[PDB]
Amino acid sequence: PSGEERCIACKLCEAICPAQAITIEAEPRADGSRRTTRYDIDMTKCIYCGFCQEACPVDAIVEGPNFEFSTETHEELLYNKEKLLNNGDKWEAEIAANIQADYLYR
Amino acid sequence: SNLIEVFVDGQSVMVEPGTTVLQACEKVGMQIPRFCYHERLSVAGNCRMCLVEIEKAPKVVAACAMPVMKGWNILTNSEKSKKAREGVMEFLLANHPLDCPICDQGGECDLQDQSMMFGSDRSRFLEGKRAVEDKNIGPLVKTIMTRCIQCTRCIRFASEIAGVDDLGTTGRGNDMQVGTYIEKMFMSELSGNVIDICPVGALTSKPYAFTARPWETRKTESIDVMDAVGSNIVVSTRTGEVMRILPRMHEDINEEWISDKTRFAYDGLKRQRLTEPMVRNEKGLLTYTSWEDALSRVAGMLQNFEGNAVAAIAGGLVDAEALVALKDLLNKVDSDNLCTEEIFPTEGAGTDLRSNYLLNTTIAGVEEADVVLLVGTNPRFEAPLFNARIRKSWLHNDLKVALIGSPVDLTYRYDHLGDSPKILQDIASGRHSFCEVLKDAKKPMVVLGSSALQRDDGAAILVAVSNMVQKIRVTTGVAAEWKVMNILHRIASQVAALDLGYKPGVEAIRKNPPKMLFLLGADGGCITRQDLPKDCFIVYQGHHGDVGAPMADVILPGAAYTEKSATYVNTEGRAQQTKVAVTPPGLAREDWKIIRALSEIAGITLPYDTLDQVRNRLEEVSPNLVRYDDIEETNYFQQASELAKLVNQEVLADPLVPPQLTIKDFYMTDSISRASQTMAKCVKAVTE
Amino acid sequence: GVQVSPSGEKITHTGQVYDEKDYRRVRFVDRQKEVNENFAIDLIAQQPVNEVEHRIIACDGGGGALGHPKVYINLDKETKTGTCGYCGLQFKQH
Amino acid sequence: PTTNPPTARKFIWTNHKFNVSATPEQYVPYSTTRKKIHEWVPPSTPY
Amino acid sequence: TSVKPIFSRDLNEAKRRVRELYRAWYREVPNTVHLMQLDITVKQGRDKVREMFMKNAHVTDPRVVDLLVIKGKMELQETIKVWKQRTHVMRFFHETETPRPKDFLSKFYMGHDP
Amino acid sequence: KRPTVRPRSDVTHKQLSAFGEYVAEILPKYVQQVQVSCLDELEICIHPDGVIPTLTFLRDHTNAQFKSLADLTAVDVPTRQNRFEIVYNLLSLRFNSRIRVKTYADELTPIDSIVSVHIAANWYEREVWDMFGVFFFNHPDLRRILTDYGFEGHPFRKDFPLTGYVELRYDDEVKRVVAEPVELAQEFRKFDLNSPWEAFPAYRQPP
Amino acid sequence: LGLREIRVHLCQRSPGSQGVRDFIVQRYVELKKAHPNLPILIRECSEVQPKLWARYAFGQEKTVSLNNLSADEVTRAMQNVLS
Amino acid sequence: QLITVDEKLDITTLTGVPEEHIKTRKVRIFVPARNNMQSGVNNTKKWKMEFDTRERWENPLMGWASTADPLSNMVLTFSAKEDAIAFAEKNGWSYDVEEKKVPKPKSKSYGANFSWNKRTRVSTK
Amino acid sequence: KVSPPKRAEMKTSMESLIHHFKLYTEGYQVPPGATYTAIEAPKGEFGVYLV
Ligand code: SF4
Ligand code: SF4
Ligand code: SF4
Ligand code: SF4
Ligand code: FES
Ligand SMILES: [Zn+2]
């Protein structure tokens, strides 16, 4: 809620990703903080399994509701940190509610 | 005999007295869990995780510290010991903070894996944890002490191996805080080893901070090239990069320990580096060009010249394959000016008789000694692990060290025998105070560095030392196989050079200033364009343009030790094989590959075309080099002595101070080291 | 911190921008590069210190099971302040 | 959301954006990282 | 030494089968360039056959030779029938792969490989 | 009684040990190393010459009517000189039981086929030949099944790379789906996951 | 044309190399005194058949397999190399 | 019946690999060294067989690490050493064998830390 | 040590966080052995021979 980036580059969303879709490359931020310099997802390798969001210890990466993001180019479906953060800043009003509804089960 | 029959889960095993339960079980295969005992450090039973029941005794015993008694059955997988381990893990993880995704020892934590095997899966802890003030040691060791388990595996290292005694424990109870009571830079040449010692991530490395994770990392077993110790090493990569360095385990060298350079100097392999062949244009400026252009320039100039007007300087971070290739390529244009940056006297046997420029004892042989005599060395700040074995011997086999040089901290008391090389003659006479001590000794070893031989009296110093040494063997009849004279180097590419037939020094080049120079990895500042002919052609085959590249008319980008399979002979003479971990960048290539290509561009076309062929050529020249890890026993020191007593060069009335005197001078002695942010940070810390 | 380079490209919170001669600027022709304007460095800097009374407190995000693992921070130092590893909030004691 | 609206946040987008796939102002991937292996810049003088 | 056979007491009785297989291929090529409309000549098809035979002439173990004969009979079955298409057959020729340079200096000009 | 762990009986273990002694003493020319596991799965191990007699026995014997072939696998273990461990899972339907017959092979030590006993073994033997390179004698077809027609290699061998040695793509120059060598835009990231701690002392290998 | 390096290859314990050790301890000092500027490399190993390489101006290397030789014949063949 | 085959067991004509990755390639047979972060030694005890590394490069789109060899992620495991030499000689790979590195046994004593005369008298506890 | 803990249990307890970590990065190290297990899939006997 403070706007602070929630990922910390613990690098297990890619440990468990059974498609090897996720890459991370991490550094200190010059504030003195464990944060990423890279978060890519080849969404042409993702199988939409949810393991990354049930492995993240901080609820940083999620798998949201949008199923209407078809494209006319392969290169558009290869995401990076900025696209994922755009998605988050777009879909927070939905994802927060979905999480509020589904927790106490997970 | 002096043996003991002991049983381990019934199974019998024969062990000496003075052993323990952990070692008895290791002889079977079981390793007992542990957080305090290391196998190289003093025992301190402070974790209480090495607890096993004995078949009928009423309680459990520390398996790291309890010596084993005749007629015992060690029950490792019994419910008593498992209950003990579960409780100990409960207590350890009670106040431990939930920082596993932050913590850089995340998939490398002994606490994790021991909780996963030998521990429960639940916390019955419903109270508030603690949180400890953190300490700002220095630019390397990143202390987060909210997670230290108070195992004291670090104070013991710093006191017994680094010889520092600036690390302890303050207070008692949960409030005991490991570290200094003050702000103090724990800044030693063996300081990054605590990062491997601390099983917990209470202290990690700052360069590796937050970068990668252990499962991501591929691991290639290579060696070091900073010093001539030959410290075995693991280079860890991640998607074609280099992430960190780690030690390997070899007991004759790099006893699980490495210096701070070779684990905080990999930063230099990605800065001020050479990536393209660069040629000098009309305005007299370097410009990126192709390989064919540069090699054609070099070969065109090479066809003309023949003999004394073609030279070569191999310095530092150079292979043996490259040396052989350049050697053959200059022999086949009948030039013999194959030289190395660092002087070694040729006024006797010279580079003949390997025993004369070699650790004729072993680095393990220091354990089997009673007196050591250091000359012209600061072994702390050059070959630090040699000094570390000296201290290991100083502790566990009470050893008396001498020193001839300047008074400088070695991590131990060293019986300073003044500052002069006339004391060598004073000893060889038989009158010095030290001979009263040495006549009692039965296994001594003098060891002189290749830092006093850079002077203008190296040959005289060697003759004095050999004379003294032969009179020493005469005095104390030692053995038919014990070596006493030894030579310590500080350069990786020197022993292979002198083995193959390179002539140490530069003096032939000053004597016959050539119209060519090949300057192979020679980023030192010995030779300059102020000393060479007008219209000279210098080509630099290397990396890390520091001072040798800008003074060159063309450049041929080479590869680093991390990026080629090569051989580097250490001080002992042990040849050791690097393994390729990451390919070299840009249009950079291997050294011998470049020389063979230049040859084919010219008319020589050297016979070999692959790496096995060059290795067989090394076999032809010196067959000691294909013998990997197989140390070879030299001889014929008497011959060198008879052949060196002939020449008569006075020794100056000059003291001999080493170049690496303080730790300020240790962190930057190379190209990789000089182009590096971490070493510069350590210098900035020490000098401020 | 979305200052631009002289080549006109936006620069990311991972200061990334392509050089002028880098041919990989083609892909942004008749296109743009996605960059997030809301930098977390400046945002978490735009956040005050939460003073407390004790030398040791805890931090989660604020939802409990919706934030991050509970961690404890010491506040004995006075020259500087505490900081969480997961979030970046700061604490001090009077 | 006219009765149970969502939380307000400074970083949430105010104006939504439909799918952009063929237009300009679409998405183009790129390496978020930086130069790792730095080159040697030679001097601008001779000898 | 002291091993079991497969279909061959010795190497000569294996070369027998080898020549039978070469024969079947030689007699099959003109039908394969015709049935599925390949754009090659029968000469170079049969030269390809002899090339892919001499790719394994160094071998002397009878068992390896028998297994190679078996796999050749499999490929011949696939080719006599049209289980495999023009793509698979013209795969043999490498009509798109540039020649691997068999020279040092070329390899040095492009790549770190030996 | 403990909920988290799996329940345990002994009568199945005893029955299968008895039947193992049965087969062992009735068929000694071939049998090696009968074994029954913690989970009660009987597992007989056989010399490769004994395949047809043993399988015909277990199919046609009265107290062993194992007349249904469930699987026919293979397992590559490069260590042992006879690499491929071949497995025959069977079931009876008269006694409501299963059994596992095992043999061994190599690249050049093939095995007799089983279509004369179990016709179900046809496509499984074809699969095993394709995947691991085990030739089967007196088999009707014995061609590939799963691999492409123009395919060199036995993929499920442990020494075979996961990504292969050839890659496909269409080319306009020749208007075919040519096969270029392999060049990936992202190397498979091998992870070193195994922990350096003895998890199970019961399987501890001594030196 | 002219000689540039000799290099001797031998073993420490294998007896076929016996003759080279004796030759060394007897004549190496006198030989170096006779040819001080010239080098002669002595590199020994565990188990290698002896050799004696000699390198002239270009890359012209020539050997003699002095395995299971005496010391006097070693000296004779070495003088043949020198001459 | 039996046969008397003398020559070296060779399989490369069966494996379906190119001549390139057979002849050009080099193989390292070894026991991996223990990670000096962890005091555990179970990741040892098995002889492995890795291949030489080759050129990786930055993919021009995203920066991923690319390859042109399939033997990059290749690792095998052998209970012993002769098994590994056999597998390599059989599949036609030139090998380099790194011998087994075992730590020296050592004489520990908790009583040496409290000596009257020795230098093992540690100043701490 | 086999099945991951509750999302809140891995945010107040250190043990369960360790177990989350190792489960979701490494796995749970099943012992050696082998099985063949079969069920009635709606088509028939779906079987898995694990080693
Ligand atoms: S998204 Fe979550 S699991 Fe992945 S690196 Fe970031 S914090 Fe770790
Ligand atoms: S949901 Fe997609 S990105 Fe996440 S772990 Fe599964 S496959 Fe990987
Ligand atoms: S040392 Fe690090 S990885 Fe290990 S338990 Fe503590 S926080 Fe977790
Ligand atoms: S800092 Fe590390 S090594 Fe030192 S006592 Fe604490 S846990 Fe042990
Ligand atoms: S290992 Fe024995 S008490 Fe620590
Ligand atoms: Zn927080």
PDB file of N, CA, C and O in Angstrom, chain F residues 113-149:
ATOM      1  N   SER F 113      11.617 -61.825 -27.960  1.00  0.00           N
ATOM      2  CA  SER F 113      10.358 -61.114 -27.856  1.00  0.00           C
ATOM      3  C   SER F 113       9.272 -62.022 -27.293  1.00  0.00           C
ATOM      4  O   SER F 113       9.451 -63.227 -27.113  1.00  0.00           O
ATOM      5  N   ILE F 114       8.118 -61.409 -27.032  1.00  0.00           N
ATOM      6  CA  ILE F 114       7.103 -61.957 -26.146  1.00  0.00           C
ATOM      7  C   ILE F 114       5.720 -61.982 -26.782  1.00  0.00           C
ATOM      8  O   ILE F 114       4.784 -62.524 -26.192  1.00  0.00           O
ATOM      9  N   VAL F 115       5.592 -61.531 -28.032  1.00  0.00           N
ATOM     10  CA  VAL F 115       4.349 -61.644 -28.783  1.00  0.00           C
ATOM     11  C   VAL F 115       3.842 -63.078 -28.843  1.00  0.00           C
ATOM     12  O   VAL F 115       2.635 -63.305 -28.962  1.00  0.00           O
ATOM     13  N   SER F 116       4.739 -64.057 -28.750  1.00  0.00           N
ATOM     14  CA  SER F 116       4.351 -65.452 -28.624  1.00  0.00           C
ATOM     15  C   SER F 116       3.697 -65.775 -27.288  1.00  0.00           C
ATOM     16  O   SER F 116       3.207 -66.897 -27.120  1.00  0.00           O
ATOM     17  N   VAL F 117       3.693 -64.839 -26.340  1.00  0.00           N
ATOM     18  CA  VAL F 117       3.082 -65.019 -25.030  1.00  0.00           C
ATOM     19  C   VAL F 117       2.034 -63.937 -24.844  1.00  0.00           C
ATOM     20  O   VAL F 117       0.849 -64.229 -24.646  1.00  0.00           O
ATOM     21  N   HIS F 118       2.473 -62.684 -24.907  1.00  0.00           N
ATOM     22  CA  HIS F 118       1.621 -61.516 -24.733  1.00  0.00           C
ATOM     23  C   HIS F 118       1.709 -60.673 -25.993  1.00  0.00           C
ATOM     24  O   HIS F 118       2.735 -60.040 -26.253  1.00  0.00           O
ATOM     25  N   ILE F 119       0.623 -60.659 -26.764  1.00  0.00           N
ATOM     26  CA  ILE F 119       0.549 -59.833 -27.955  1.00  0.00           C
ATOM     27  C   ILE F 119       0.613 -58.354 -27.607  1.00  0.00           C
ATOM     28  O   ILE F 119       1.004 -57.537 -28.448  1.00  0.00           O
ATOM     29  N   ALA F 120       0.260 -57.989 -26.375  1.00  0.00           N
ATOM     30  CA  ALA F 120       0.354 -56.608 -25.929  1.00  0.00           C
ATOM     31  C   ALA F 120       1.776 -56.078 -25.966  1.00  0.00           C
ATOM     32  O   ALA F 120       1.971 -54.859 -25.971  1.00  0.00           O
ATOM     33  N   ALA F 121       2.769 -56.963 -25.984  1.00  0.00           N
ATOM     34  CA  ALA F 121       4.160 -56.560 -25.936  1.00  0.00           C
ATOM     35  C   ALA F 121       4.679 -56.030 -27.260  1.00  0.00           C
ATOM     36  O   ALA F 121       5.808 -55.539 -27.296  1.00  0.00           O
ATOM     37  N   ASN F 122       3.893 -56.103 -28.332  1.00  0.00           N
ATOM     38  CA  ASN F 122       4.358 -55.668 -29.644  1.00  0.00           C
ATOM     39  C   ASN F 122       4.766 -54.203 -29.624  1.00  0.00           C
ATOM     40  O   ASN F 122       5.933 -53.852 -29.853  1.00  0.00           O
ATOM     41  N   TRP F 123       3.812 -53.333 -29.320  1.00  0.00           N
ATOM     42  CA  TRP F 123       4.075 -51.911 -29.397  1.00  0.00           C
ATOM     43  C   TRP F 123       4.980 -51.459 -28.265  1.00  0.00           C
ATOM     44  O   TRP F 123       5.711 -50.477 -28.411  1.00  0.00           O
ATOM     45  N   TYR F 124       4.991 -52.188 -27.154  1.00  0.00           N
ATOM     46  CA  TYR F 124       5.899 -51.843 -26.068  1.00  0.00           C
ATOM     47  C   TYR F 124       7.338 -52.175 -26.417  1.00  0.00           C
ATOM     48  O   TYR F 124       8.253 -51.416 -26.086  1.00  0.00           O
ATOM     49  N   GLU F 125       7.562 -53.300 -27.084  1.00  0.00           N
ATOM     50  CA  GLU F 125       8.898 -53.631 -27.539  1.00  0.00           C
ATOM     51  C   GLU F 125       9.358 -52.649 -28.600  1.00  0.00           C
ATOM     52  O   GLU F 125      10.532 -52.265 -28.636  1.00  0.00           O
ATOM     53  N   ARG F 126       8.440 -52.215 -29.460  1.00  0.00           N
ATOM     54  CA  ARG F 126       8.778 -51.182 -30.429  1.00  0.00           C
ATOM     55  C   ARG F 126       9.172 -49.885 -29.737  1.00  0.00           C
ATOM     56  O   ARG F 126      10.160 -49.241 -30.110  1.00  0.00           O
ATOM     57  N   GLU F 127       8.410 -49.494 -28.715  1.00  0.00           N
ATOM     58  CA  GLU F 127       8.727 -48.301 -27.944  1.00  0.00           C
ATOM     59  C   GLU F 127      10.086 -48.417 -27.273  1.00  0.00           C
ATOM     60  O   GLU F 127      10.843 -47.445 -27.215  1.00  0.00           O
ATOM     61  N   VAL F 128      10.408 -49.596 -26.751  1.00  0.00           N
ATOM     62  CA  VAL F 128      11.665 -49.772 -26.038  1.00  0.00           C
ATOM     63  C   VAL F 128      12.833 -49.712 -27.007  1.00  0.00           C
ATOM     64  O   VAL F 128      13.871 -49.110 -26.712  1.00  0.00           O
ATOM     65  N   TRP F 129      12.691 -50.341 -28.171  1.00  0.00           N
ATOM     66  CA  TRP F 129      13.715 -50.231 -29.199  1.00  0.00           C
ATOM     67  C   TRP F 129      13.927 -48.779 -29.603  1.00  0.00           C
ATOM     68  O   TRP F 129      15.066 -48.313 -29.720  1.00  0.00           O
ATOM     69  N   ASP F 130      12.835 -48.045 -29.816  1.00  0.00           N
ATOM     70  CA  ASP F 130      12.945 -46.654 -30.236  1.00  0.00           C
ATOM     71  C   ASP F 130      13.606 -45.794 -29.168  1.00  0.00           C
ATOM     72  O   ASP F 130      14.481 -44.978 -29.473  1.00  0.00           O
ATOM     73  N   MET F 131      13.205 -45.968 -27.913  1.00  0.00           N
ATOM     74  CA  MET F 131      13.604 -45.046 -26.863  1.00  0.00           C
ATOM     75  C   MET F 131      14.981 -45.360 -26.305  1.00  0.00           C
ATOM     76  O   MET F 131      15.736 -44.438 -25.983  1.00  0.00           O
ATOM     77  N   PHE F 132      15.316 -46.643 -26.167  1.00  0.00           N
ATOM     78  CA  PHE F 132      16.538 -47.071 -25.509  1.00  0.00           C
ATOM     79  C   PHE F 132      17.483 -47.864 -26.393  1.00  0.00           C
ATOM     80  O   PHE F 132      18.657 -47.991 -26.041  1.00  0.00           O
ATOM     81  N   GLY F 133      17.022 -48.391 -27.520  1.00  0.00           N
ATOM     82  CA  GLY F 133      17.900 -49.081 -28.434  1.00  0.00           C
ATOM     83  C   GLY F 133      18.092 -50.546 -28.152  1.00  0.00           C
ATOM     84  O   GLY F 133      19.176 -51.077 -28.413  1.00  0.00           O
ATOM     85  N   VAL F 134      17.072 -51.218 -27.637  1.00  0.00           N
ATOM     86  CA  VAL F 134      17.116 -52.637 -27.329  1.00  0.00           C
ATOM     87  C   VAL F 134      16.398 -53.362 -28.452  1.00  0.00           C
ATOM     88  O   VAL F 134      15.190 -53.199 -28.645  1.00  0.00           O
ATOM     89  N   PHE F 135      17.150 -54.159 -29.194  1.00  0.00           N
ATOM     90  CA  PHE F 135      16.589 -54.961 -30.262  1.00  0.00           C
ATOM     91  C   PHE F 135      15.940 -56.209 -29.684  1.00  0.00           C
ATOM     92  O   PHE F 135      16.414 -56.783 -28.701  1.00  0.00           O
ATOM     93  N   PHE F 136      14.823 -56.606 -30.288  1.00  0.00           N
ATOM     94  CA  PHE F 136      14.038 -57.746 -29.839  1.00  0.00           C
ATOM     95  C   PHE F 136      13.944 -58.764 -30.963  1.00  0.00           C
ATOM     96  O   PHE F 136      13.496 -58.439 -32.066  1.00  0.00           O
ATOM     97  N   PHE F 137      14.351 -59.995 -30.670  1.00  0.00           N
ATOM     98  CA  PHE F 137      14.375 -61.052 -31.667  1.00  0.00           C
ATOM     99  C   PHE F 137      12.974 -61.508 -32.038  1.00  0.00           C
ATOM    100  O   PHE F 137      12.041 -61.443 -31.235  1.00  0.00           O
ATOM    101  N   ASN F 138      12.865 -62.025 -33.263  1.00  0.00           N
ATOM    102  CA  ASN F 138      11.666 -62.653 -33.826  1.00  0.00           C
ATOM    103  C   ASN F 138      10.402 -61.860 -33.504  1.00  0.00           C
ATOM    104  O   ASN F 138       9.373 -62.396 -33.093  1.00  0.00           O
ATOM    105  N   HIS F 139      10.501 -60.555 -33.705  1.00  0.00           N
ATOM    106  CA  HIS F 139       9.408 -59.604 -33.634  1.00  0.00           C
ATOM    107  C   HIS F 139       8.838 -59.377 -35.032  1.00  0.00           C
ATOM    108  O   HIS F 139       9.601 -59.285 -35.997  1.00  0.00           O
ATOM    109  N   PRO F 140       7.507 -59.300 -35.221  1.00  0.00           N
ATOM    110  CA  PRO F 140       6.980 -59.092 -36.574  1.00  0.00           C
ATOM    111  C   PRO F 140       7.433 -57.819 -37.281  1.00  0.00           C
ATOM    112  O   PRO F 140       8.055 -57.903 -38.345  1.00  0.00           O
ATOM    113  N   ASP F 141       7.139 -56.649 -36.716  1.00  0.00           N
ATOM    114  CA  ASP F 141       7.463 -55.371 -37.340  1.00  0.00           C
ATOM    115  C   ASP F 141       8.774 -54.789 -36.827  1.00  0.00           C
ATOM    116  O   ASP F 141       9.756 -54.701 -37.568  1.00  0.00           O
ATOM    117  N   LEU F 142       8.805 -54.431 -35.546  1.00  0.00           N
ATOM    118  CA  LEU F 142       9.936 -53.792 -34.881  1.00  0.00           C
ATOM    119  C   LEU F 142      10.487 -52.632 -35.710  1.00  0.00           C
ATOM    120  O   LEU F 142      11.596 -52.656 -36.240  1.00  0.00           O
ATOM    121  N   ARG F 143       9.633 -51.636 -35.840  1.00  0.00           N
ATOM    122  CA  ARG F 143       9.985 -50.318 -36.324  1.00  0.00           C
ATOM    123  C   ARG F 143       9.728 -49.323 -35.202  1.00  0.00           C
ATOM    124  O   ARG F 143       9.252 -49.677 -34.126  1.00  0.00           O
ATOM    125  N   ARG F 144      10.076 -48.069 -35.450  1.00  0.00           N
ATOM    126  CA  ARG F 144       9.777 -47.020 -34.494  1.00  0.00           C
ATOM    127  C   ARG F 144       8.270 -46.878 -34.312  1.00  0.00           C
ATOM    128  O   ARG F 144       7.471 -47.383 -35.104  1.00  0.00           O
ATOM    129  N   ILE F 145       7.888 -46.174 -33.250  1.00  0.00           N
ATOM    130  CA  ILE F 145       6.522 -45.702 -33.080  1.00  0.00           C
ATOM    131  C   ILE F 145       6.554 -44.193 -32.919  1.00  0.00           C
ATOM    132  O   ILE F 145       5.980 -43.454 -33.723  1.00  0.00           O
ATOM    133  N   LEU F 146       7.231 -43.737 -31.876  1.00  0.00           N
ATOM    134  CA  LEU F 146       7.015 -42.409 -31.333  1.00  0.00           C
ATOM    135  C   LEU F 146       7.905 -41.351 -31.956  1.00  0.00           C
ATOM    136  O   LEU F 146       7.491 -40.193 -32.069  1.00  0.00           O
ATOM    137  N   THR F 147       9.114 -41.716 -32.346  1.00  0.00           N
ATOM    138  CA  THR F 147      10.026 -40.759 -32.936  1.00  0.00           C
ATOM    139  C   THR F 147       9.668 -40.498 -34.390  1.00  0.00           C
ATOM    140  O   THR F 147       9.004 -41.299 -35.052  1.00  0.00           O
ATOM    141  N   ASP F 148      10.107 -39.344 -34.879  1.00  0.00           N
ATOM    142  CA  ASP F 148       9.939 -39.017 -36.281  1.00  0.00           C
ATOM    143  C   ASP F 148      10.662 -40.042 -37.141  1.00  0.00           C
ATOM    144  O   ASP F 148      11.560 -40.754 -36.689  1.00  0.00           O
ATOM    145  N   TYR F 149      10.244 -40.118 -38.403  1.00  0.00           N
ATOM    146  CA  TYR F 149      10.740 -41.162 -39.287  1.00  0.00           C
ATOM    147  C   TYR F 149      12.229 -41.002 -39.536  1.00  0.00           C
ATOM    148  O   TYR F 149      13.011 -41.938 -39.336  1.00  0.00           O
TER     149      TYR F 149
END
